[PDB]
Design a protein around this ligand. Structure first.
Ligand SMILES: Nc1ncnc2c1ncn2[C@@H]1O[C@H](COP(=O)(O)OP(=O)(O)OP(=O)(O)O)[C@@H](O)[C@H]1O
Ligand SMILES: Nc1ncnc2c1ncn2[C@@H]1O[C@H](COP(=O)(O)OP(=O)(O)OP(=O)(O)O)[C@@H](O)[C@H]1O
Ligand SMILES: [Mg+2]
Ligand SMILES: [Mg+2]
Lengths: 86, 251, 91, 745, 222
């Protein structure tokens, strides 16, 4: 959880995020997620804002990004098969 | 004896390719037809006017041997004819390199001054003097037949209007292959790099290739198409070698 | 006024004191007496300080009026490493 | 408007209906506006009765242009008719920045008298709209000493005023405020840069680079597959941890290292101790005293110049540096003298203080003063009175120049006397025709060199192409050395003139290549120096590749100068690519101690101040010219025209001239009480915002960092959020931040 | 629009001036790999073509009677032939060892210069020349992972003195393993950015070669 919150801070450093983005909450919504998924969550979160012609990414955009990346794209997740290998 | 030491950092060529060379005039802003642009445009012209007068004066009193057409003629004499085509095996020093002719015989020859030294890389096709085998030029490699296969020279005639019902699919694919190029500011003002890769999946006949064809029709970027079955090669390592070369053409 | 001058001194930032501090003394005294009291007035060690007044180093022997000081003059305190005798004797 | 419309389109407009102009169309007035300027030039003095309706249109054309965001066309109208004055009366709150930003960008190309005049109108607009921080920036560019006081004291918001002192102190111009002014103390303290050391030290503590660096960590000899070496590493030592106060090599038992140098090597080695205490006036003076009592002639004199380096760039109220060195400007040993004047020159560069000047002036006229001492006095006095046109120094520098012999002027140290005269008129312009007339009487070829140099420093940062036209003609005629010594100054002149705007500077790079191709040795030996001056602390690849090819040149000076130029081009940038090139150049020039000394010198410069310092003379978005910094640079590069005898010889202390040009590439945002205030900022390459209306981004390829970050050349900074309103739009150096009332509404 | 007529007039003049400048200076060819004339030292090149003879690359195989004053060297000139030759008088006898490539002239094939060992061009391209733009600050949640990574791959090269004094032989190998996307290549890109020694990136699929023993050859030359 501490590491995931740190990766969120790294990838959302240069973003145009809102005031109170609960990055600890976002790290909690993806328990077993690679840093690659976290970067995509940040990219899709700002991608929803571009979709709505908005210059600032809100916390809802990150919540939708987590659903699209962590949840919707969990069918293609390489994590479950590769933890057995590692 | 001590081994020669290069002054150039590394053994690879310069990354920049196909630039404006010395025609890289300063970018004058704004593009609006105003006096400031006129003042900047005159400013560039003023220096060129100085440049024209300065260069002419030197060449006027330059010796008859040292002239722009004479030195070019002397270059051809130094290069000679025929001009052998070899392979750069190693850059021993700034002005020395190991080259191999087509017969497989390697030579330790000298790179002459007029050679474009930043196009020199190991494995590149070098031009050598017929007699002394000295490096006298670099052959601009012709487009590989492998390059022509990937490149779609003419954009397909299928547009987005020819696709029905894939409104979300077009919107998602546009935002990773089309929007980042047409309007890159949207991603920079947000601080996000565009979605890196995209995969189109579904039942056969659902329009996966069609949307890619529509992407290729309205793209300013080079479009390389390779079927996955084309990555299965008849020899070991060739498949990995081909995937490596495909993204090298993309670079 | 009455034979006392307004000498404003400067303290090094290591001694976290008010850099705009006021020192009051006579003019008939000399540099040797001056250097001693500046150490006491702001809690410093006299053996490791140079004093400079009127943009010229405080000559210890010469008295203040014959040094060239005046009213509302400005000074500073320079911390020292190794004494003036110790530094000369070092090598 | 369909046909040529010569004296027709306006005529039916002028004589016809006098209704509102825009009723006939925006395209009609645009052609009509283009006409009124065309006929304005044709109209002579006797035609003043013909401009009665002509004036009425421009009182309506300008309000029409600003209404439809076509503002830049409005400036184009009254600049042509030379009537820029009436703009301010009709400037609105919605376009004051756009109008100012446009014509201020035209000040880099429009010549006198429209140069100052365009600025004055922009100055009036900012003063009208109470935009004081950007009003003060315009005033300094015009070097209007009087206007600086009026701008400073007009403001009533004291929070707004301390920001200027930061900007004013960075430029090195001192203001003597009255005690009646509220908050007098901190206002002087801020502009006197006395707190610069603490702010600098607190910065790097946040960047956790307080650890001292040995030259070996710079050299990296463990990856590599003498008096000069020891003296070279003394510069590499001091440069890397300059102004840091801590060093593992000099503070820790400096005697073995300092005495490991020999001859004049100990001169620079001792003075290197003052450079690691740069801006540490109080604490730095505490450390040089140990070497101030040294019996060796060089160590004390090196420690003498160390005090001047310590006090360089800092102006405190009560003056230490003059005291410790006044007693030695007439000391019998020249070396003791030598460490004095160059100490005073750095200690009071850009001061115009008559106290030091009058104490320093008779030194040049002394019989015991050699030409080596004679040069440094002109150099030093030039730094104190840079760009001031001081009458006293001009008389004595001229007096010394013609009193010297024909054979005496042959010495290359005599080249420094013209620089002192040239330094006094830095950027002044056409105030030299009286001075240039005096240079007529002196003998050749020194007169040609002196005439070229002082003329160049006259137009520094002006970009006057006509002057550059003369400079290229001097380079045109080649001589089959002695008679062509002046040709090197002309090449350095082109960089010194074109360093104003980007367009001229890049247009000068191609001309430098042609001097680098058709040139003769003495002409080609100085063009590496021009590249360094034109792009100092700007490690662009075009110049570096140009220099990289020419590091291993046949001519030793070109090889020496090019490598040094690479270091100065990347001075304080800590460029990983440049350090790799310099490391490779060290391998190539291992068996050439002279070339290697230049390679070692460059390695120290590229890691200057551990990357926290810059030598670029420009600040305030590369729009303000610093007099002191150019003095420090000019001192070094003009000394490099004879790199064999001065830099590589016994006079390498002149390399400490760039101490006057050392400033931190700073962004420290302070609260209203001057305390640190770390917030999120966006740092990226600047983007021209002239022309395009609306809100265009001024940065591209940007990233978000906390405030105490080092800004590279050409990298602008914008606050990522809106929590604080900066006092000044220019986010460089120390910035005061104020809470935004709309924020958190 | 008032300056539109004059802007094109000066724009065309600049283009005409630019083309005229290229007429005198010369910006052309670039397809035979010709450098811009600013770097053309024709006078030197003529001297190199006579003073500096070309040297054929050969490999020394055996030195005969190395103890005596007449040491004879057997060289293998690639695909040309094998020659028993003597050493040139401008190089030392101790500088030529058996199995080392040498440069020989075309007349008497006497060895003129030792040469670096032959390396596959593909292997030569494996060393990183431009470092990545990724630092350790871009890797999050790998604090313990990085310190272990740095103290083996970074610390010994940066500060080798701390290990020789204590008689410590630092580990010479690190294996990074984890699920995809966990930062394995990200950390190696940070290592290459920070490292000062030579960095060689080798992808395992690059070592797969068509012919027998070729993949092991590239590991040897690597
Ligand atoms: N949504 C659609 N709108 C319009 N035409 C469509 C659509 N889907 C399919 N088509 C038509 O079907 C043709 C063949 O489909 P296409 O080549 O795009 O298949 P695909 O989705 O790539 O599938 P696969 O390669 O698995 O067979 C296209 O040329 C196009 O004319
Ligand atoms: N710890 C991390 N901190 C920040 N970003 C990370 C981290 N781990 C991964 N990323 C991001 O995710 C991306 C995944 O690429 P990376 O090269 O790190 O994967 P990998 O672990 O080598 O995967 P694979 O096993 O498939 O090769 C990185 O490019 C980076 O942007
Ligand atoms: Mg298909
Ligand atoms: Mg990987």
């Amino acid at each position: 959880l501490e590491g995931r919150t740190h990766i969120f801070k790294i990838h959302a450093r240069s973003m145009s995020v809102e005031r109170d983005i609960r990055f600890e909450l976002l790290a909690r919504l993806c328990p077993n997620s690679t840093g690659a998924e976290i970067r995509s969550v940040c990219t899709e979160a700002g991608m929803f804002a571009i979709r709505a012609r908005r210059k600032i990414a809100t916390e809802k955009d990150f919540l939708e990004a987590v659903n699209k990346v962590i949840k919707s794209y969990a069918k293609f997740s390489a994590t479950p098969r590769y933890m057995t290998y590692n | 004896y001590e081994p020669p030491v290069p002054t150039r950092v590394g053994k690879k060529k310069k990354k920049t390719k196909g630039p404006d060379a010395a025609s890289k005039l300063p970018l004058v802003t704004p593009h609006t037809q105003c006096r400031l642009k006129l003042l900047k445009l005159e400013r560039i012209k003023d220096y060129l006017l100085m440049e024209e007068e300065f260069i002419r004066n030197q060449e006027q009193m330059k010796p008859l041997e040292e002239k722009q057409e004479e030195e070019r003629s002397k270059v051809d004499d130094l290069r000679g004819t025929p001009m052998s085509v070899g392979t750069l095996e190693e850059i021993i020093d700034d002005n020395h390199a190991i080259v191999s002719t087509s017969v497989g015989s390697e030579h330790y020859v000298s790179i002459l001054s007029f050679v474009d030294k930043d196009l020199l890389e190991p494995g590149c096709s070098v031009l050598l003097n017929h007699k002394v085998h000295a490096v006298i030029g670099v052959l601009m490699d012709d487009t590989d037949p492998l390059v022509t296969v990937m490149k779609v020279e003419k954009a397909p005639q299928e547009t987005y209007a020819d696709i029905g019902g894939l409104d979300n699919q077009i919107q998602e694919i546009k935002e990773s292959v089309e929007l980042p190029l047409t309007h890159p500011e949207y991603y920079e003002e947000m601080g996000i790099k565009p979605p890196k890769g995209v995969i189109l999946y579904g039942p056969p006949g659902t329009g996966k290739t069609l949307l890619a064809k529509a992407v290729a029709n309205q793209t300013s970027a080079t479009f390389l198409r390779v079927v996955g079955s084309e990555l299965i090669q008849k020899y070991l390592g060739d498949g990995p070698k081909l995937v490596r070369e495909l993204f090298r053409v993309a670079e | 006024t009455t034979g006392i001058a307004t000498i404003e001194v400067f303290l090094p930032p290591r001694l976290k004191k008010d850099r705009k501090n006021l020192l009051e003394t006579r003019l008939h005294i000399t540099g040797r007496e001056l250097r001693s009291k500046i150490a006491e007035t702001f809690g410093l060690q006299e053996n490791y300080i140079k004093i400079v007044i009127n943009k010229k180093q405080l000559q210890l022997g010469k008295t203040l009026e014959e040094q060239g000081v005046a009213h509302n003059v400005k000074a500073m305190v320079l911390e020292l490493k190794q004494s003036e005798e110790d530094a000369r004797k070092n090598f | 408007m369909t046909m040529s419309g010569e004296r027709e389109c306006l005529k039916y407009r002028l004589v016809g209906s006098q209704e509102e102009l825009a009723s006939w169309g925006h395209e009609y007035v645009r052609h009509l506006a283009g006409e009124v300027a065309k006929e304005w030039q044709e109209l002579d003095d006797a035609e003043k009765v013909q401009r009665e309706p002509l004036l009425t249109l421009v009182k309506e054309i300008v309000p029409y242009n600003m209404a439809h965001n076509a503002e830049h066309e409005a400036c184009d109208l009254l600049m042509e008719i030379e009537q820029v004055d009436m703009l301010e009366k009709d400037i609105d709150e919605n376009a004051y920045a756009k109008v100012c930003l446009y014509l201020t960008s035209c000040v880099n190309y429009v010549p006198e008298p429209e140069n100052s005049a365009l600025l004055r109108c922009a100055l009036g607009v900012f003063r009208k709209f109470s935009r004081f921080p950007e009003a003060l920036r315009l005033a300094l560019m015009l070097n209007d000493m009087e206007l600086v006081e009026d701008i400073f004291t007009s403001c009533k918001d004291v929070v707004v005023q301390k920001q200027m002192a930061f900007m004013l102190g960075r430029h090195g111009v001192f203001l003597e405020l009255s005690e009646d002014v509220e908050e007098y103390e901190d206002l002087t303290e801020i502009m006197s840069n006395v707190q610069l050391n603490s702010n600098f030290l607190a910065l790097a503590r946040e960047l956790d680079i307080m650890e001292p660096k040995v030259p070996d960590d710079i050299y990296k000899t463990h990856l590599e597959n003498s008096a000069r070496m020891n003296l070279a590493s003394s510069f590499v030592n001091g440069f890397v941890n300059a102004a840091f106060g801590q060093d593992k090599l000099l503070t820790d038992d400096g005697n073995k290292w300092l005495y490991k140098n020999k001859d004049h090597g100990m001169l620079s080695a001792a003075a290197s101790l003052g450079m690691i205490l740069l801006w540490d006036v109080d604490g730095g003076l505490t450390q040089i005293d140990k070497y101030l009592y040294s019996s060796e002639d060089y160590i004390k004199s090196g420690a003498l110049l160390a005090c001047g380096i310590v006090n360089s760039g800092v102006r405190n109220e009560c003056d230490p540096a003059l005291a410790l060195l006044s007693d030695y400007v007439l000391h019998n040993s020249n070396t003791m003298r030598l460490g004095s004047i160059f100490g005073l020159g750095l200690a009071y560069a850009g001061s115009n203080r008559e106290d030091v000047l009058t104490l320093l002036l008779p030194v040049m006229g002394d019989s015991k003063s050699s030409m080596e001492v004679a040069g440094v006095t002109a150099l030093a006095c030039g730094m104190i009175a840079v760009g001031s046109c001081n009458g006293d120094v001009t008389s004595t520098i001229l007096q010394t120049i013609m009193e010297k012999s024909e054979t005496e002027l042959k010495d290359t140290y005599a080249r420094w006397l013209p620089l002192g005269l040239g330094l006094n008129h830095l950027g002044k312009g056409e105030a030299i025709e009286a001075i240039l007339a005096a240079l007529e009487v002196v003998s050749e070829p020194f007169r040609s060199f002196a005439n070229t140099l002082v003329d160049v420093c006259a137009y520094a940062g002006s970009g006057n192409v006509l002057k550059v036209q003369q400079l290229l003609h001097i380079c045109s005629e080649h001589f089959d050395a002695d008679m062509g010594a002046h040709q090197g100054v002309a090449v350095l002149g082109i960089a010194l003139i074109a360093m104003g705007e980007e367009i001229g500077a890049e247009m000068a790079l191609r001309t430098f290549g042609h001097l680098l191709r058709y040139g003769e040795p003495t002409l080609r030996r100085a063009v590496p120096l021009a590249l360094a001056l034109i792009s100092v602390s700007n490690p662009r690849l075009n110049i570096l590749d140009t220099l990289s090819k020419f590091s291993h040149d046949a001519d030793p000076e070109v090889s020496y100068n090019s490598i040094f130029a690479m270091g100065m081009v990347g001075s304080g940038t800590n460029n990983a690519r440049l350090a790799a090139m310099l490391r490779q150049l060290a391998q190539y020039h291992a068996k050439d101690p002279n070339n290697l000394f230049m390679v070692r010198l460059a390695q120290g410069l590229t890691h200057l101040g551990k990357g926290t310092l810059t030598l670029c003379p420009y600040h305030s978005d590369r729009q303000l010219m610093s007099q002191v910094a150019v003095a420090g640079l000019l001192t070094v590069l003009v000394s490099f025209l004879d790199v064999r005898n001065i830099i590589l010889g016994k006079s390498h202390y002149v390399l400490y001239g760039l101490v006057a040009a050392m400033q931190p590439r700073m962004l420290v945002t302070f609260d209203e009480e001057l305390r640190p205030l770390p917030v999120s900022v966006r740092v990226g390459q600047a983007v021209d915002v002239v022309g395009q209306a609306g809100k265009p981004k001024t940065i591209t390829g940007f990233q978000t960092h906390t405030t105490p970050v080092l800004l590279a050349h050409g990298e602008r900074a914008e606050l990522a959020t809106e929590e604080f309103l900066p006092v000044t739009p220019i986010l460089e150096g120390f910035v005061i931040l104020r809470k935004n009332p709309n924020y958190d509404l | 629009s008032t300056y539109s007529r004059q802007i094109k007039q000066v724009e065309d003049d600049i283009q005409q001036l630019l083309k005229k400048i290229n007429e005198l200076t010369g910006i052309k060819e670039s397809d035979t790999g010709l450098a811009p004339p600013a770097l053309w030292d024709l006078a030197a090149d003529k001297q190199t073509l006579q003073s500096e003879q070309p040297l054929q690359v050969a490999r020394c195989t055996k030195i005969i009677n190395a103890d005596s004053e007449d040491p004879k060297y057997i060289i293998n000139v690639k695909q040309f032939a094998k020659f028993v030759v003597d050493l040139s008088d401008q190089v030392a006898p101790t500088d030529i060892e058996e199995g080392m490539r040498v440069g020989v002239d075309r007349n008497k094939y006497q060895i003129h210069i030792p040469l670096p060992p032959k390396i596959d061009p593909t292997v030569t391209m494996m060393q990183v020349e431009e470092k990545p733009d990724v630092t350790y600050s871009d890797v999050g949640g790998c604090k313990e992972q990085i310190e272990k990574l740095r103290e083996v791959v970074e610390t010994p090269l940066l500060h080798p003195e701390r290990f020789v004094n204590l008689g410590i032989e630092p580990p010479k190998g690190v294996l990074l393993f984890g699920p995809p996307g966990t930062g394995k290549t990200l950390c190696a890109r940070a290592v290459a950015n920070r490292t000062d020694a030579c960095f060689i990136r080798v992808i395992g699929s690059e070592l797969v070669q068509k012919y027998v023993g070729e993949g092991a050859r590239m590991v040897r030359e690597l």
